[PDB]
Amino acid sequence: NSYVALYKFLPQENNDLALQPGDRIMLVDDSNEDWWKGKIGDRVGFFPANFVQRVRPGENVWRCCQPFSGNKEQGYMSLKENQICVGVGRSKDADGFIRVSSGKKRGLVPVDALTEI
Structure with a gap:
């Protein structure tokens, strides 16, 4: 719930x-x-x-602290400042990105584009 x-x-x-x-x-x-x-x-x-969006047990909530322009065809999701994202902190990758969902969209975003609420 x-x-x-x-x-x-x-x-x-x-x-x-x-x-x-x-x-x-x-x-x-x-x-x-x-x-x-x-x-x-x-x-x-x-x-x-x-x-609203589901948050499962063990998922983190972040807000976007700087805009990000992402190439959707390659699996990157653009973010606006203050946009809310959900994912799992330890899933961050070797290259400075992390996959998160925001509303009905999902993709890779920079770790440094996210901060705790």
Whole structure:
């Protein structure tokens, strides 16, 4: 049931849940395709389904600290500053990169383009 927020979300309705990038969220209800219910702290409410990503046990959450332009055809994923990424720290490679997922995309990014939330 564990997710992370990818983007800022300001509540529109009383029943909404405010999100900040990097927030850990417990999923409560994904029965609607557009609006999911979840919990952060003691707050519960709705947010856009596409604003979150799964985080598995033993996965790290990072934010991009400098932009990276990546060649997608070779398996590199471009990053914008403040973009949220999920991966496993010890999977970093011999060449200064690491594979991470961000939203629906995945690829190699520089280790030095990432920092802890």
